[PDB]
Specification:
Chain B: This is Transient receptor potential cation channel subfamily M member 2. This is part of a larger assembly, with four copies of chain A. Chain A is an all-alpha fold. Chain A is built from 28 helices and no strands.
């Protein structure tokens, strides 16, 4: 009763109280009352875990609503109605449900035993770790919120060690064991659980990422780097020779050039550079529409700049409607608005419009010249948001995530410290170069160029011994303190969070792979076909339930049994050795003597 | 506009007189001033007061309007170090200016270390090449002022350049001690003391 | 105060180096214990 | 021992910040009764608690002295 979820149990008693939602009397808790708050505790998935609807709707039962003659919420399928429903039992899990009941009464070591008979043994150790994180997230205020998440870490460490054994034996089955079906906790088969369970550890563990290096690099190979794959992507007849071998060509399944092409087309490594180097070619097109085509007329080239952006916002509308809910239009947009980077992508939209109306007013063609030139640099930072892809690229751009607000910091630190000398240089020497908005040039613009080198030394040079002086005094603070101790500001913080910055980047490897699994094989030239391929499909099928370019692994219950009985065997195999490695702690054997000699204290006391 | 510069400083020393009389003792006038004089930073705030007065009497003597030009320009930079004493406020600002508290006397150190080591080459550059640019207080310019500008870049390479194989030589030999030893091992002098 | 210092003593009691020498205190009670006949 | 008694002072705020931190910051500010004034924070100035004032919610209470009334959160 002292649990804060018990206060939420009293809340979920009145989340749907007696009169408004469960119209007969209900000051008594039931089990769909637990399911509807398990709706809140997990995400938005398939949530069986209790037969929730009107067949076993456990929400309304204290006054006599009659039998299945209603069948709208009344519950009498198993036996007669005696303010009960009968043996309508656990429906996938006795002991995985006792794994909940220990931790929602906050009984840690009982769930340690119950896990050893619980049949989930990987995904529960993620989901309850998320629930222990949920229990840490909601309310404890001291003394167990840390102990939830440490146990959640330990249950993630439990989830660490059970994949540690099962990857070592039949890794190919283990990656299939990573992808089960929507049966027990419904969907989120122990990898999509790990996204909101925040497994920055577990997804970055051995062959999880190597399987993700088989999701990315979906079919063909894994082995070849960026050297000879980029030769074949321009040299189209180079594929037919023996330069690279497909997994098709591994068994020599290449007998069709289209099978050599379309397995290559639907490979996620190729959808990337097709999406990149066409859009990389658009930034050259956006330059050439301003380099030579800085013209007030729609030319043959000026009209081509119009709807490239229209060819890509439907992919974000495809991201706005692939699999969110059918109700949240302003709510999954908060998932967009949760990130400033997405607002940095909105900034790439609106600075185009700021120059568009400045171009549509022909009196502002110099604002038509300058605004879209500053819209250019918003895409390459957005491209550095995209080209966070290599082990040498990616986690070191996760270092700049600690530095983006520190980009604004050392800017404001140093460039205001420039004003301490940028005014002080032109003070004593008699300068006379001034115009309208070039008085600013002869005092301020000729100060920053002298830092990086453009020094009018025959212009700025009896006040010569001071011109030596303050040029020596000021650079002792910038080039020595603000530069070389800034190196200490960067070396230590690189060594500080380097284990996080690799693993969080591996925790955000998959989101681009998710986006490159849910993506057609058409280039942004031809992606308007696949834009309209769903629009000709959304006039003959008005439902968002056609295909799921996703995990979607369907598993038979019989073939699962050969996996899971072996997996349950790997559970008690590993935990014994885990206990044995815990038994290999010598600090027990320090105090094992202490337990033994305390059995010898009383042992000389029988005469 | 010139009259507006008078009593802004008079508007703030009463706040320090408010700091001199908010809650010290009713007896110590020369004793809580030792709490002020315990810090060189407070004497660095006294230096912001007196360099104003050094240019004030130089402005009040109209024959010294060029001392009226130069002294208050050097009084300007005493306030921004006093502002860095004030803008020790952020977690990203503050404790890294507590690093420069280990470096303020080391600001004077590497100044005296390097700028006297400049004289080991700042004289040695004009020795062999036949230079002829001299005036009254511009003989100092053509030998000393054209040496430090060549460090950070303003090189009269068509002026300073048979003694050409040595002009390659000592320009390679001297920068091996400043840019390599005195710069990159100074990075080791700063990384370790930060850690 | 007495809530924390008990746990602070208990975390001091959680030092295993006492339990190293707690055996040494115990076996020194068993040195004399075989000396009654 | 002064460090250990500061470490004693560490651990007693460590428990009392965890339970009723809002009372604990009021417990940081008592009256001029026992040792008179310097209610366990102005003691710490001349007691040289570079450890204890930089401990959890001491500075966060000082992040409620600074940011006195309105909010704390916005940068």
């Amino acid at each position: 009763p002292s649990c804060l979820f018990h206060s939420k149990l009293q809340k979920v008693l009145v989340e749907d109280p007696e009169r408004p939602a469960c119209a007969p009397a209900a000051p008594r808790l039931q089990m769909h009352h637990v399911a509807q708050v398990l709706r809140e505790l997990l995400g938005d998935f398939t949530q069986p875990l209790y037969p929730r609807p009107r067949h076993n709707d456990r929400l309304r039962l204290l006054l006599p609503v009659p039998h299945v003659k209603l069948n709208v919420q009344g519950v009498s399928l198993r036996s007669l109605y005696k303010r009960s429903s009968g043996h309508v039992t656990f429906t996938m899990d006795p002991i995985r449900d006792l794994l909940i009941w220990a931790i929602v009464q906050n009984r840690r070591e009982l769930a340690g035993i119950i896990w050893a008979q619980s049949q989930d043994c990987i995904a529960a150790a993620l989901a309850c770790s998320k629930i222990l994180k949920e229990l840490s997230k909601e309310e404890e205020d001291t003394d167990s919120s840390e102990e939830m998440l440490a146990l959640a870490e330990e249950y993630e460490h439990r989830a660490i060690g059970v994949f540690t054994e099962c990857y070592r034996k039949d890794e190919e089955r283990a990656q299939k064991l990573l992808t089960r079906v929507s049966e027990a906790w419904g969907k989120t088969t122990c990898l999509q659980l790990a996204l909101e369970a925040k497994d920055m550890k577990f997804v970055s563990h051995g062959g999880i990422q190597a399987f993700l290096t088989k999701v990315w690099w979906g079919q063909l190979s894994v082995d070849n780097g960026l050297w000879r794959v980029t030769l074949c992507m321009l040299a189209f007849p180079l594929l037919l020779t023996g330069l690279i071998s497909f997994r098709e060509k591994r068994l020599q399944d290449v007998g069709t050039p289209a099978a050599r092409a379309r397995a290559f087309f639907t490979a996620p490594v190729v959808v990337f550079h097709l999406n990149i180097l066409s859009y990389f070619a658009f930034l050259c097109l956006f330059a050439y529409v301003l380099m030579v085509d800085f013209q007030p007329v729609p030319s043959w080239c000026e009209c081509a700049i119009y709807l490239w952006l229209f060819s890509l916002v439907c992919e974000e509308m495809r991201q706005l409607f692939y699999d969110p809910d059918e109700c949240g239009l302003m709510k999954k947009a908060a998932l967009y608005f949760s990130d400033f980077w997405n607002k940095l992508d909105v900034g790439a939209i609106l600075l185009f419009v700021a120059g568009l109306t400045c171009r549509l007013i022909p009196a502002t063609l110099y604002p038509g010249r300058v605004i879209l030139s500053l819209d250019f640099i918003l895409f390459c930072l957005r491209l550095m948001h995209i080209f966070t892809i290599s082990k040498t690229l990616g986690p070191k751009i996760i270092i700049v995530k600690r530095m983006m607000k520190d980009v604004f910091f050392f800017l404001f630190l140093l460039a205001v410290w420039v004003v301490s000398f940028g005014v002080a240089k032109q003070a004593i020497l008699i300068h006379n170069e001034r115009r309208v908005d070039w008085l600013f040039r002869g005092a301020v613009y000729h100060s920053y160029l002298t830092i990086f080198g453009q020094i009018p030394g025959y212009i700025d040079g009896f006040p010569e011994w001071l011109t030596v002086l303050l040029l020596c005094l000021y650079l002792l603070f910038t080039n020595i303190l603000l530069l070389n101790l800034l190196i200490a500001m960067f070396n230590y913080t690189f060594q500080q969070v380097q284990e996080h910055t690799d693993q969080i980047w591996k925790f955000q490897r998959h989101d681009l792979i998710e986006e490159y699994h849910g993506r057609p094989a058409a280039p942004p030239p031809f992606i308007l076909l696949s834009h309209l391929q769903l629009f000709i499909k959304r006039v003959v099928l008005k439902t968002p339930a056609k295909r799921h370019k996703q995990l979607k692994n369907k598993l038979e219950k019989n073939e699962e049994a050969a996996l899971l009985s072996w997996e349950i065997y790997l559970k008690e195999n590993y935990l014994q050795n885990r206990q044995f490695q815990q038994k290999q702690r010598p600090e027990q054997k320090i105090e094992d003597i202490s337990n033994k000699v305390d059995a010898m204290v009383d042992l000389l006391d029988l005469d």
